[PDB]
Structure formats: structure tokens, C-alpha cells
Amino acid sequence: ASVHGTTYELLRRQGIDTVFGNPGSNELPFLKDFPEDFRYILALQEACVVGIADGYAQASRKPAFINLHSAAGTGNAMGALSNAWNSHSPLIVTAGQQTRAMIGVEALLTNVDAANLPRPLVKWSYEPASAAEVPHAMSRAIHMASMAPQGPVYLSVPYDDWDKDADPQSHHLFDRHVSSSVRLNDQDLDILVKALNSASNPAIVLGPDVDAANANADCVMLAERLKAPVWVAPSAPRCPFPTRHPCFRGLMPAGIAAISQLLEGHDVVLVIGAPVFRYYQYDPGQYLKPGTRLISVTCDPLEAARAPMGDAIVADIGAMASALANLVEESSRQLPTAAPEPAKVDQDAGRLHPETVFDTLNDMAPENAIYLNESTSTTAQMWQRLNMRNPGSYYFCAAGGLGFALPAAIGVQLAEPERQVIAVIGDGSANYSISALWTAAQYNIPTIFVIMNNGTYGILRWFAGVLEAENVPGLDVPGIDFRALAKGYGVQALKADNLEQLKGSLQEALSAKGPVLIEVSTVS
Amino acid sequence: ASVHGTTYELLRRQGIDTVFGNPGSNELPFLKDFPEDFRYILALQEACVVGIADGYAQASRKPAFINLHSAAGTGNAMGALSNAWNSHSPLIVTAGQQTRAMIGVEALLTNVDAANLPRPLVKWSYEPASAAEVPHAMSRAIHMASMAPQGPVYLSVPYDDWDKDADPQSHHLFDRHVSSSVRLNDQDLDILVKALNSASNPAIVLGPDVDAANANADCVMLAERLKAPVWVAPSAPRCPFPTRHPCFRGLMPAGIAAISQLLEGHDVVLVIGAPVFRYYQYDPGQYLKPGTRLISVTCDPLEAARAPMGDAIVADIGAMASALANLVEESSRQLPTAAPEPAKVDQDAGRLHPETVFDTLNDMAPENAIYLNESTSTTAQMWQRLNMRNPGSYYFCAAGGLGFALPAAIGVQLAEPERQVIAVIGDGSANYSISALWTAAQYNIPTIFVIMNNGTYGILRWFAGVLEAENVPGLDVPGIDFRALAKGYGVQALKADNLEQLKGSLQEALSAKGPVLIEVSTVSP
Amino acid sequence: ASVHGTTYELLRRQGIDTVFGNPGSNELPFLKDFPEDFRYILALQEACVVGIADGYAQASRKPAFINLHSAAGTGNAMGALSNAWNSHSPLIVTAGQQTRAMIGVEALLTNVDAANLPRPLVKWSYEPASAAEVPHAMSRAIHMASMAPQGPVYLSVPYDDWDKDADPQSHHLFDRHVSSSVRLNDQDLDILVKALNSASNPAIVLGPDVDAANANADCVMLAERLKAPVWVAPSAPRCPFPTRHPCFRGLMPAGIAAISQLLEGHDVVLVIGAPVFRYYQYDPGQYLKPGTRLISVTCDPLEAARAPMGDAIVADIGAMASALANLVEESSRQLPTAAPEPAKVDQDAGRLHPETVFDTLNDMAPENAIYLNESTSTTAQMWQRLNMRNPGSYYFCAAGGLGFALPAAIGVQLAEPERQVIAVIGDGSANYSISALWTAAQYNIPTIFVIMNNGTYGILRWFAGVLEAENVPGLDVPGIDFRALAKGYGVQALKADNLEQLKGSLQEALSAKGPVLIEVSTVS
Ligand SMILES: Cc1ncc(C[n+]2csc(CCOP(=O)(O)OP(=O)(O)O)c2C)c(N)n1
Ligand SMILES: Cc1ncc(C[n+]2csc(CCOP(=O)(O)OP(=O)(O)O)c2C)c(N)n1
Ligand SMILES: Cc1ncc(C[n+]2csc(CCOP(=O)(O)OP(=O)(O)O)c2C)c(N)n1
Ligand SMILES: [Ca+2]
Ligand SMILES: [Ca+2]
Ligand SMILES: [Ca+2]
Ligand SMILES: [Mg+2]
């Protein structure tokens, strides 16, 4: 058997049947004789390729396979990999390398010191020392990406390797099962449950790894058992809790003082599946107010190590959430009261307020809709106004790297064809991966794109105000016609200059058969 | 003085007055109080920001300054940095980092292992140990970028550093002059000259570093004195020789066997300013045929070390080219036999052949026009059919990384407002950096973009053909409206479905005052 | 408080009270005002510092703290870090950096690209961006080194940081508890238990991580339950099992074909706490013969991902071994019969056979002795002839990096003052970290060093034979007088040119009160 055949059988047996790519000469030998049982998803830009695979991996909760072209292709994908690292996305990234005979002279398309290129944004980077080693390296890549903490991995393969003969003993690779679904030992776990039962005013904080492990339901039960208010960790890449649940308290502000102030009065704080903490703005103060004890459960050793306070437990979030939810006593305390419904903002017949857009989406979108957010100046309003009952309903670039939501929305839609994906993207962020639109049109992926157009870098303007910075250039982005951009890539475009038009467009988009883009004129 | 004021004074004193950027919160403290003598050029994407800066640096023959945001921004620009490494572009890439007080907890926007991120694609990568060191670090970066072999450098700066006090002794950095324009010592230089003089059949091979050093004229004199045929190194990122000069033989095919054959018979082969060699396709054979002696002159130690044959000299192209040009004696040998004329290919009144397009461009474009090529399948024909007699008249992505030409065509146009830039770009390549068009509109850079739309990844379909590779997915890119994309970013758009329309389109484009995009319906392979 | 005080308090609160080091100017501001509750162990060389700390960490099953000088000091120690990586030794390596004001100009003693230097032989490499962060960085290092899979970490600190003001919120670091004591979920653990109970002919293979977790007893129980033969994985760094137990089958030869042959007939092979596998010699063949299924329990994701065959479970060895040992049913199968005692080799009145030396050590050493092996050409003989009943009784360079055993023997002896340490080192290996002897004499660490002198690189001479390689230079090391070297460093020395002198020297050595070195004349 050839390395080519052996490799595809490996992918197939490990449950991988989709290839997200942008091709090059180095990758032709691998793409040739493409298995009929495999699917290839072309994106025009590498940043788009990874974004789409990222959305697909996250929604499907399974590793995604990518094929890029040498250093140039890998390089273009770097920004996307930065997000994938933060969101623990299981991405197997392969890139074609020059033929071994030509690597020495550094011929054109040679990926120099290839393993080093994507570092430090991957848990594993590797180039095999021989063709026969390739299947085994691929097997390594598959399990490294899938083991906790999940993350992107990198593999470089010289194009001449694929036709070579593969080692017959590679058959042992096909059916390897690697598990990391583990939880705290019985003894220590009982001590933890003791502590939770004995707390007089517990609070719970959930991060994206809860949604990734589909432990949302288990967390809901745990909260109901402890009668505890629930928060989502700051800078949230996902949503791990029904946002209308009486326990839900909303998105924590990404500041040190702000968070210790919020947790004040809570004697024990259970953090599940989140870093402690993913702060953003400079907000000096106490990490925790005296009287508050923090206990962290995380799947990532790097997160437990760098937390500046509290105890940490490194385990699988799914197994841990399940264990706790089923072991804690039912507290007699009153169940928390659901937060009040957001106030209706005053809306004239002009440009729409971000609050109005969200309220309208909430009224018109299906109950099982999936939202992506890359509208940076309106994130807070988005969490308050969208009712998200189900898991996997929200995605936001995990490292703050723009260009994520647009291609990811296509990947997510591909992963969940029964759920309407609605991406809310700012006029600024939209340009980073605009060409992903073409993939949506080409593969009939009925994703809905809502472009929030206020002609500027909203968030940046705000920051410039709180720093008091004057004469800052490059904050404005006038002169972009997004309907023409969407026509450029074969996507139906609509405009919403006002509320009347916004409802009309939303109704039309929801009904349309293919992907639709709506340009909304929002206030500055 | 603040680190902010000191750093801007250093850039000012070092001849930098332009900043290509895409801003983020980590960079606000730096962009604030933007000096009135500085000019900021905004790009919607990072790849686009770097590409434009690259074109600007290569055409101006001076280092370019870039400001990006954290790892996300730097990452988006990696593909572009691969090209820049290969073309020795002097680029100074600075990226904002999180406040020092917030790095430890790895807050959002922290650039982890910052200096490691752009490796191995930069000459130098660094994050200062404190605020006061920032100005010094910036100096190191400026000089690392400008010193032979020129290249991109990376500097990460925590945003809280800008408002801090600078070391008073930082003033010593302002007027620092560093020179690397050196040449072979007199003794060894005379020996080399003697070799060239005694050669009975020398050949010359020029690389992109010749055009970078503006050594084209000196190389012409040298070629004329030696009466030697002149070739351009394979995968040529630039043009270092008048393509219509009688010594010019053309672009070398990127194959080991193809090159040894072309050089057969030449007792002495002098290679100037090129890697040896930048092969591409697998084309196994002899590196050099017996009886052929090769001498390479490079400014990059890495190039001299990796060459699989010949002697090498690591020196400044400018100085070396000038020295040799004026040292070699005039040979009485006869000039090289005149090269045949590119045939006028068959063309009906339907979709245009790439050759028809190049012939028309060469007939209508000004003598001092600058071309940028990102049409991968038509490169060979472009070189045969375009008369480029001046320096700085050609750019092609140096590492083969697509997404170069479009933004770079804007950078080049900015650097040379008196020369008409004409980007020839395949429908595939055009998508990698499409948003760059917005920058041309916003700042009214009158670059002309010619999109060769054949609906496919031409070069790939061909390579798949020779490999007898059947059932290869992802080679077709149908359903792309480029006039609509141009409109989306505010650029005037025209279309050419046939020869007559192409001519009229070019005429209109050359008389336009702003950027113009022309979608050309070319024949699919 | 100062960064200096805060830091010593953190180490104190985290259980650290010993600094192994070799000082430099960059380390003076750290070492000044050395806390009275801390002890400092000086070594003449860096490879020796880390070797000693490594031995101490392995034997105490706790993280060892190290202090080295800048780049030159760190550099000198990288061979030893190579062993520590393979042994999963929890070493916290700290190295002084130039003052922040001088790093830019690259003054003398400046550690350029400090974080990159130790890579990739460390779990985590870091240099704080400010002095106030030093304490937090130290916290990360401590936890990163202690979390499974344990291993070495590296922190570079500019010497001017120590005298700076610490962040008051640093107090949150002091009592952080981080646990990775985890095991497979009940559901999946039940399936594994069933597979083991239904096994018709199971075998067990143990690695060094068993002895590290002190799960030896649990493994014994598991073995007796299942009535299964017990191997030790190849290239063994430690001894995870009593070598005279009825189930004990010995150390597996370090080859592919040899191991699959040995496992032939066993339907289920359970590998615990070992890579799969640490092969050495070139022995091509089947990874496993048909009919043999393999299950591996490892605490290291890198090991699980790279095994060429079998299923894997990534969990804590201590927790998993305990659960399994108490869950599996008692088999009705007949308990294996103990391996027959090794034959007595013929010994004339001249030089000594390695076999004779081990037989004599076994006869005269205490039952709780601790052996360290650096006699590369006599490892097999050593495993068969030494009866090691207890945990922590054997150590061997885990990456085959020589210069480990001499200093490590000192570290182990320091960690275990009640157990006699006996290091068996070849004349060749003795030279790599010879100056370590000084430390044993300085602090009167009564380690016994047995030098096997055959005046050559035995193992190398043997390998040159298999490859029929002739005319190989540098294989002989004549003219080394080890008694004079011991005298040079203040250690009592004895000689043994024959069996009668071996017995004599051994009795005196064991009766000795300080360290002793015995030079034994062994056959070629
Ligand atoms: C790749 C990348 N480039 C730049 C930034 C910095 N950045 C963050 S938000 C933002 C403005 C986003 O504009 P828009 O999409 O309009 O959101 P708005 O603030 O207008 O709601 C920028 C430039 C980033 N986070 N990632
Ligand atoms: C960033 C990047 N991605 C992928 C490739 C591989 N690649 C080389 S040529 C090519 C197709 C280019 O098509 P087009 O621009 O239409 O030129 P044509 O071949 O059609 O003439 C691709 C995908 C590359 N060189 N750079
Ligand atoms: C630092 C280091 N250098 C070299 C080697 C290679 N090596 C392994 S064993 C050996 C010879 C050891 O000889 P000795 O300690 O006398 O034992 P003998 O083979 O004589 O029994 C060498 C050179 C190594 N493993 N580590
Ligand atoms: Ca905006
Ligand atoms: Ca094309
Ligand atoms: Ca020896
Ligand atoms: Mg890198």
C-alpha cells in the first residue's frame, strides 16, 4: 500500500471525511485520486480556509482537517490559528512541502524550518524524516489535536512522500482510540462536593469549554441544585448556558476590579471550563475580595498554572460537569430570580441602533438559531438581547483576531444544516475575510450575514476616548458598498437603511434558499 | 522625553516619514499624537498592509515602517512576510503588545512568545525588557532591516511603554549611520577581473538584488564590455536588465537540467545578485556541465552557503557591479545572436489569449511603465512580450506567495507617482488581497489592475496534467464578478470580453485620474 | 514586600526548602539574605547541580528547585535536562539574567533569547516582562513542573527585579493547590475492567511513571489479581515492580521484533506508565503479532499520541493503578511461577566479571538499598542479579545521557538518608560529572560509588561489532586513576582487583560513615 492510500484510510477510520483547503503544487500529489467518500471545501484565502474549518470543528465538536500550501499558505492562516489556539479548536493543519531532493537548495515553495513557522500557536508542529513515517505522523497529529486540551496541530509533508510505499505495520494506526475523558479521583472529588454543599452563597462561572464538551445541560442542573447565580467568563468565545435561565447573570466584564467586585459576598466560586481570567481592559485592583474562595476546573494545564488565585483541577470538563451535577445535594435556598428583560431603546425612522437590531433578530430568528459575533462595539448589548436556549448558539473570535466570524459562520452552518446561522459582523471586521462569501455561494451554504455598517472602527474610537488619545489616524472606513461585494462573490444582497427595511430584509433572508447578506446602516 | 516622542524623533531622523498600518487597541498609545510630518496609510487587512509596504520599500529602495496589532495582526501578515524574506525587502514590522502588567495572566490581546511568532521569516525578532529600551530596540530594528542582506524585522512593544520616560542617552541613536556597501579587496578583485578578461565565452546571470541596488546600468556596461549573453535568474522577483538589450537572452526556466543546458559551452558564468539557484519544478540533471566554471556575487551569506556549485563572493551588489563594470576590458567578440521575435498568436473575436493581452499592453503602455505579475500561468509569455528598458519595471511575488501583486502595485504606485503601474493578476490570485483595492480608492493611487479571468487555477490544472493527476478537487473558481468587487471598494471598473474592448478599456484606463480595474475574459486551459 | 521576599514566601508555602545551585553575579541579588529555613546545595558543575536535583526530585517524588548562572550555566546543564525530560522529573530551573537596563546592549552575561535556550527540553520556558510579575511567573513554573506529565521548566530573571516592589495581590499565589490526580470516568473504566476480567491470557508491562507515582504496591495487587506475567518497559529509567515476584518476567529487550515475540500468546496487554515503546536497537518487524490487543495508561499526551499501536488512556498513574487494582475480579488462573535464579558465572583469581560484582552486591547490600546504573554494557546482568524488593530502588539515565548517575546518586542519598545508595558506573561514564564527588564530601552524603573499570567504552565496542564497523577511533579510555580523582575531591577511595578484594572493600564501604568510591577491575 502507498502512503497516499494508507493516509486516507487512516483519516477515514478516525472519522475524518472532509478536507478544507486552498491548493498548491506541493499539495497536488496528495489531492490526486481524491477518495470519492471524501469532501473538499475550497476557500479562496487561507485565513478563510482555517476560519471555516474552525467553525466546523467547534460546532461538530470533532477534529477538522485542513490542507494549505507551503509557507505562504500557512503564513496567511496565522491570524486564524491564533483564534483556534484560544478556543481549543481541534484542527489538523497539513501543508505541502517541496520534494526532498529540492529542499536542500531551497527551491521555490520550500517551507524553511517548517515546524517552527506556526509556533507558538500550535500544540504540535512536525515534519517527518521519511515518507514511510508520514501515516504515523498523521496519526500523532490526529490524537494531539483531539486530546485535552484540544488545539491546532501542524504537519509538513514533502510532496514526493505520497507515492512512496507505506510500512505494512501502519495498519495498527487505523483503529487506535485515545481517551482523555477523566475526572478527579473519588477521594478528592468528595472533598470538593463537601465544599460545594457547605457553601452558604455559591456562585458559578462558565467558560467556552463547557459548550465545547456539550456540558451545558449538566451545568444547568448543577446550578439548579446549588441555587447559584451563573456568569459567563469574560471575552467569551462561546455560550455555555441558556441566557434566559433564572440563574443566568450574563457576561462578566473583562476587568480585574470589576470581577472581584461582582464576586464579592460569594464565599465559594466554582469556575468551569474557563481561564482565570481572560481579562481585557486595564482595571487594576484585587483579584478576589477577602471572604471569596475560588475553585477552578479546567482541561488545560496552562490555564491552571497561570491563574493568579484559587485552587485548580485539571480534568475533562464533560466528565467533571457530569460528576458534580449528579453528586451535589439539592440546596433548600431559593432559586435565583431571572434577570429583567432589557429595556427597549428609542428608535426613530433613521439609522438603526445596535439594540434595535438585536431585539429584532430575537423576535424574528428561530429558537434554535446560531449567532456569530464580530461586531465589537456592541458585544455587551448582544448578550443581553439574544435569547439563546440551546448549546452551540454563539461564537466569538477567541483571541480577538478579526476575520473569524464570517468564514466560521459558513463552517458552522455546514456543520449544522438544520439550524439557521446568523453572523453579525461590523463593516470593519467584514473586510478581513470577505472572500469567504464565495465558499458560501459555491457550496450552497445558506448562512445569513448581517453587516453592521457605521463607517468606523467603533470600539477603537471608544478606546481612544478612554485613553484620551487625540489625533489618532486610521479609525475610519468610509466608502465600502457591501451589497456590491456580495454580488461580487455570488451572494444575494439586501439593504436595511431603517427599521421598516430591516424587518423586511430579515423576513426575506430567512425565507431565501441560499446565503444572504444584509447591509444595515447603524448609528455612529 | 517620552518613549513616544523619542521613537518618533528616531524614525524622523532615520528618514522614515510613512506608516503603513491596521490599528488595534494595543497600538493606540503609539498612534496617538501622530506627528504632523508623518503620513499614515491604512489597509483593511494585514496581508494588504504588508504587501503595500513591500511594494513601497522595493520601489523606493528604502526601508518601510509597518504597525500591526498583537499576534492576530502579525499572524494575518505571515504570508506576506514570506515573500518579503525572499525579496530582501527592508521592512520594519512593529506590533502592539498587552500592558506589561497584564501579560502574565495572558489577558486578551496578549502576544505569547511574541518574538517567536514571525520566525523563521524575519532577520531579527525582539521584545524589549523594559520601556526605556524601546528607542534602542527600534534603532536595532531599523539597522537590521537596512543592512545587507536586507530583510524584514519584528519588534513587539507593550502599549504602556509609550508614555514612559526614555533614557536621556537615547539621543545618540538619532544620527547613527551604518554602512554595508562593501566590495571584494583589491587583490582578490583583480584576480576575478583577470578571469572575466581571459574567458573566451562568458555568460552573465542577474538576480533581483541587482534591481534593488539600482545596479542595472553598471550590469549593462559590464555585459557590453564582455559581449556576454545575459540571463535573468529563475523565479525572478524583479527585472535587472533591459529586456530589449541585444545581450538579453530572457528568463531562465526554473529547472536544474534546463539551466545546465542553457549554460553549456560557457567557460565562465558570472551570477550577480541571485540565489543559485531558485529552481522550482523537479527537473533532475547536472547543476553545471563540465567545462563550465561559475562565480556568484551575493549580499546574502545564506545564498552563498547553499549554492550547490561554484565560487561565491559575499559583498554589496551596488559596489561590486560598479567596480567590475569599470574594471573589465572591452572585448572585441561579437554580440550575441539576435533573439527571435515573439509570434503573434492566433486570436478570434472571442475571449482573449494571454499573448494577445501582453502584445496589446506592450503596444499601448508607456515606455516607463511598471508591471506587477501575479498571473502564474502566463509568466513566461509576459517576459518575452514586454519591453522593459528601465530599472524597477517588474515585480513578482518572491516566495511565490499569492496576494502580493495587488497591494504591492499600490505601494509601488505611491513610491513612483510619475510612472504608471500596471498589475496583471489572475482571477485566482486576485482574491487573496482583494480589500487592498480600498486603499487605492481612499488615497487615490492611480494603479491600473488587469484581471486575467479564465475561471480557474491555470497553473495548477497544468501541473495536475503533467503529473497525470486525475480527480483533483478545488481547481475551479467560477462565479466571481470583479467589476462588482471593484465597485464594492470604490474603484472604477471596466470589462474586456474581446480584443476591441480590451483596447478601448486600456485607452480609457490610461487616461483615468484614479485607480482602474479591468476584467479581461481570457481563454481557459 | 519586595519581589525577593514575596518569592521566597511562595516557594516556602509551596513546600520548597532546598536550592541546588552554582552561583554567578546575576544570581547574587537572589541569593542574598538567604532564608534560614532554606538550605543550599552547591555543586562544582551545572550538569552536576541538575543531576543532583534530578535525583533528589525523583526519590522524594517532589519538585526540586535549581539556580544556575545565565546562558553559560543553563547551557552546561542541557545534557542533564535531556535526561530530566525523559524521566518526567519535576525540576524548576531558574537562571539569573543581566539587569534590564543592560540587556539591550547585550552586556557580558546577558542571556540572549533566554526562553529559547532550553527548548525543547522543558515543559515551559519564560522570562517575565516586569519585576512585579516575577512572583507570578515563579508560581506558573512550580505548577507547570508539578502537573502531570511532570517535567522541567525554566525561568529567566533579570537580577534587578528582586529588589523591586511586589504586587500586593501576589499573596493569592501562596496557597494555590493544583491537582491532576485524575482517572477514567466510571463508564469507560467499567468497560476497561470488563475487558481485563474477560482476558484469557493478559500480560502487564510497567514503566517508570509507576515508581514515580509510588503505585508499585497497587501494580503488585493488580498483577496478583489477574495472575498475569509482569514486564518492565524497555530502556527502563526506574524499577516499578519487585524483581523477585512470581509474576516478574524482567526487563524487555529494546526492540520491535523482540517485544512482539515476547507478547505473542497474550490476548490483552496492559501497559502502565511507559512510552509505547522506548525501543533502542534496530529490530524491525511486527509491532504486535495478531491476536494481541494493547491498552496503554499514560500520564503524558505526547506518549499516547505517538504509540504505533493500541488504545490509550491519558490519566494519573497513581489514581488509575489504585482504581484498577481494586476493581478487577480475582482470576482463577494459576499464579505464574517465579523466574529461575541466575546461574553463577565462573570467576578466576584475576579481574572481575560484571556478573560476579552484582552477585556480590546482592549478597552484601542491605535489602532496602538503592542502586543507580550507568554501566551501559551490563544493564541486563544487573536487572537479573539484583533483588530489588522496594519502590525507588533503581535509577538510570532516562535519555541515555551519561553523567547522570554519579550526581543523581548524591541527590537520591540526600532525599533518602535511611537507605544506602549504591551507584554502579563504568570508567567511561564516571568522567562526565566527576566533580559531583566534591558535593558528597562537602555535605557528608554517604553515597557509595562503585566504578567498573575495563578501560573502554564497552557498549560502543560491542555495537561496533554488530555493525561490523572497523577502524572506529575513540573507543578506549586507558590511564584513569579513579582513586586519585576521589582523593582530589575528598572522598575515601578503595580498590578491588579481584573477588577477595571486592568483598573486603564492600564490607568497609558499607561500614563507612561518609561517601566512598570503589574502583573495581572488570573484564574487557
Ligand atoms: C486581525 C485584527 N486586526 C485588527 C484588530 C484590532 N481591532 C479590534 S476591533 C477593531 C474595529 C472593528 O470594527 P467593526 O467591525 O466596525 O466593529 P465596531 O467597533 O465598528 O462595532 C480593530 C481594528 C483585531 N482585533 N484583529
Ligand atoms: C497564498 C498562496 N496560496 C496558494 C498558492 C498556490 N497557487 C499557486 S498558483 C495558484 C493559482 C493561481 O491562479 P491565477 O491567479 O488565476 O493564475 P492562473 O494560474 O489562472 O494563470 C495557486 C492556488 C500560492 N502560491 N500562494
Ligand atoms: C553525554 C553522552 N555522551 C556519549 C554517549 C554515548 N555513549 C553511551 S554508553 C557510552 C560508553 C559508556 O562506557 P562505560 O561507562 O565505561 O560503560 P561500558 O560500556 O564500558 O560498560 C557512550 C560513549 C551518551 N549516551 N551520553
Ligand atoms: Ca464599525
Ligand atoms: Ca486563472
Ligand atoms: Ca568501560
Ligand atoms: Mg513562528
Swiss-Prot record, chains A, C:
Pfam families: TPP_enzyme_C, TPP_enzyme_M, TPP_enzyme_N. Binds 1 Ca(2+) ion per subunit. Binds 1 thiamine pyrophosphate per subunit. InterPro entries: DHS-like_NAD/FAD-binding_dom, THDP-binding, Thiamin_PyroP_enz_cen_dom, Thiamin_PyroP_enz_TPP-bd_dom, TPP-bd_CS, TPP_enz, TPP_enzyme_TPP-bd. Residues 376-459 are annotated as: Thiamine pyrophosphate binding. Its EC number is 4.1.1.7. Ca(2+) binds at D427, N454, T456. One of its GO terms (biological process) is mandelate catabolic process. Pathway: Aromatic compound metabolism; (R)-mandelate degradation; benzoate from (R)-mandelate: step 3/4. Belongs to the TPP enzyme family. It comes from Pseudomonas putida. This is Benzoylformate decarboxylase. GO terms for molecular function: acetolactate synthase activity; benzoylformate decarboxylase activity; flavin adenine dinucleotide binding; magnesium ion binding; thiamine pyrophosphate binding. Transmembrane segments: none annotated. Homotetramer. Keywords: Aromatic hydrocarbons catabolism, Calcium, Decarboxylase, Lyase, Magnesium, Mandelate pathway, Metal-binding, Thiamine pyrophosphate. The keyword Metal-binding applies. The lineage of its organism: Bacteria, Pseudomonadati, Pseudomonadota, Gammaproteobacteria, Pseudomonadales. It catalyses: phenylglyoxylate + H(+) = benzaldehyde + CO2. Mg(2+) binds at N116, L117, R119. Gene3D superfamilies: 3.40.50.970, TPP-binding domain (3.40.50.1220). Its cofactor is Ca(2+); thiamine diphosphate; Mg(2+).
